[PDB]
Design a protein around this motif. Structure first.
Motif, PDB file in Angstrom:
ATOM      1  N   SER A   8     -11.628  -6.227   8.338  1.00 54.88           N
ATOM      2  CA  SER A   8     -11.680  -4.730   9.057  1.00 54.88           C
ATOM      3  C   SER A   8     -10.411  -4.209   9.243  1.00 54.88           C
ATOM      4  CB  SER A   8     -12.838  -4.580  10.405  1.00 54.88           C
ATOM      5  OG  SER A   8     -12.054  -4.471  11.634  1.00 54.88           O
ATOM      6  N   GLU A   9     -10.137  -3.020   9.438  1.00 61.28           N
ATOM      7  CA  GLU A   9      -8.763  -2.490  10.157  1.00 61.28           C
ATOM      8  C   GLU A   9      -7.849  -3.304  11.348  1.00 61.28           C
ATOM      9  OE1 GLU A   9     -11.248  -1.115  11.143  1.00 61.28           O
ATOM     10  OE2 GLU A   9     -11.873   0.361   9.081  1.00 61.28           O
ATOM     11  N   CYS A  29       1.584  -4.812   3.257  1.00 62.83           N
ATOM     12  CA  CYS A  29       0.864  -4.788   3.570  1.00 62.83           C
ATOM     13  C   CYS A  29      -0.095  -6.309   3.723  1.00 62.83           C
ATOM     14  CB  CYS A  29      -0.326  -3.316   4.659  1.00 62.83           C
ATOM     15  SG  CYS A  29      -0.907  -3.219   2.397  1.00 62.83           S
ATOM     16  N   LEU A  65      -3.796  -8.666   5.093  1.00 63.53           N
ATOM     17  CA  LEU A  65      -4.713  -8.344   5.307  1.00 63.53           C
ATOM     18  C   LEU A  65      -5.033  -9.994   5.590  1.00 63.53           C
ATOM     19  CD1 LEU A  65      -7.604  -6.526   5.754  1.00 63.53           C
ATOM     20  CD2 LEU A  65      -8.060  -7.426   3.564  1.00 63.53           C
ATOM     21  N   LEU A 103      -5.257  -6.123  10.035  1.00 64.52           N
ATOM     22  CA  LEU A 103      -4.563  -4.975   8.422  1.00 64.52           C
ATOM     23  C   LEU A 103      -3.290  -5.178   9.076  1.00 64.52           C
ATOM     24  CD1 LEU A 103      -5.796  -2.026   6.595  1.00 64.52           C
ATOM     25  CD2 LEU A 103      -3.784  -3.204   6.560  1.00 64.52           C
ATOM     26  N   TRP A 120       0.805  -0.733   0.076  1.00 63.91           N
ATOM     27  CA  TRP A 120       0.005   0.278   0.182  1.00 63.91           C
ATOM     28  C   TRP A 120       1.082   1.018   0.126  1.00 63.91           C
ATOM     29  CZ3 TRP A 120      -3.175   2.077   4.575  1.00 63.91           C
ATOM     30  CH2 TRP A 120      -4.203   2.927   4.003  1.00 63.91           C
TER      31      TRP A 120
END
Lengths: 123, 123
Positions: free
Chosen positions: A117-118, A93, A95, A121, A88
Motif C-alpha cells: 500500500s502507500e 520511486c 515500492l 512507497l 513516477w
C-alpha cells in the motif's frame, strides 16, 4: 507437476527476472489461462490472461529485484519479497512488495496476491 | 478498530520484538482468543489461544529480526519477511520466513500463515 518447494523457488525467481526485463508475453504465459490476480491485495481481482496482459502492459523504465529468498511450501505455494523501482512522473520511486502465489498441477500461477500500500512507497 | 495500513506495520513489528525476547504470554495475547495458525503453511492449523501458547512454548535461545519492511494492505492484512536464528541440537541454524496475518476489528491476529520449508533452512 505441482511444483516441489525447490521448483517453486526457481519459478518465482524467474518471474522477477521477467518483470525486470519487461517481457510481458513471457510473464503472461507463466499464468494459468484463467488465473486471477489481486494487486494490490484488497482490490477486486483481475481474471484471465487477457486482463492480466492488459494489467502488465499498463504497468510495465522499470527494474525489479528479489530482496530476500523465496519462501516455498510443499503444497505449490510460495511467497517472496521484492522491490520495484520506477519513475513516477519524472519523479523516481520505489515500492516494496510481497507476492504470494499458488501454482497449479502444470507449474503455472493459478493465483497471485500482492501485499503493499502507500506505506511501502518511497517516492 | 480494523488496523489501518500504518497500524498493521506497527503491530507486526511489535510481534517480532516479542518473538525475539521470547515473551510467550505477550505473544499469545496478540492473537484473537480463537485465532488459527498454520505454521508452516501446508500443515493442519492450530486453533485457539491454548494450542497457540503450547505451540510457542515448544518452539521458543532464539532471536528474530525483520529482514525487510512490513507490507500492509488497507483491509487488515499484512505480510513480513524475517529471519529466525536458533541452535538445533548444539548446531546453530537460521530459517527465513514470511508471515501473512489478518487482524480483526479489535487489532488482534485472527489468522496467521507462515511460509517456509527446508529450502529456507541454513543449518
Amino acid at each position: 507437476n505441482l511444483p516441489t518447494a525447490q521448483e517453486v523457488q526457481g519459478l518465482m525467481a524467474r518471474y522477477i527476472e521477467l518483470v525486470d526485463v519487461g517481457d510481458i508475453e513471457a510473464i503472461v504465459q507463466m499464468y494459468a489461462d484463467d488465473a486471477t490476480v489481486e494487486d494490490p491485495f484488497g482490490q477486486p481481482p483481475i481474471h484471465g490472461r487477457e486482463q492480466i496482459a492488459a494489467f502488465f502492459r499498463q504497468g510495465l523504465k522499470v527494474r525489479a529485484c528479489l530482496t530476500g529468498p523465496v519462501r516455498a511450501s510443499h503444497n505449490g505455494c510460495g511467497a517472496m519479497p521484492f522491490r520495484v523501482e520506477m519513475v513516477w512522473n519524472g519523479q523516481p520511486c520505489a515500492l516494496d512488495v510481497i507476492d504470494v502465489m499458488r501454482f497449479d498441477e502444470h507449474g503455472r500461477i493459478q493465483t497471485m496476491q500482492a501485499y503493499w500500500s502507500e506505506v511501502n512507497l518511497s517516492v
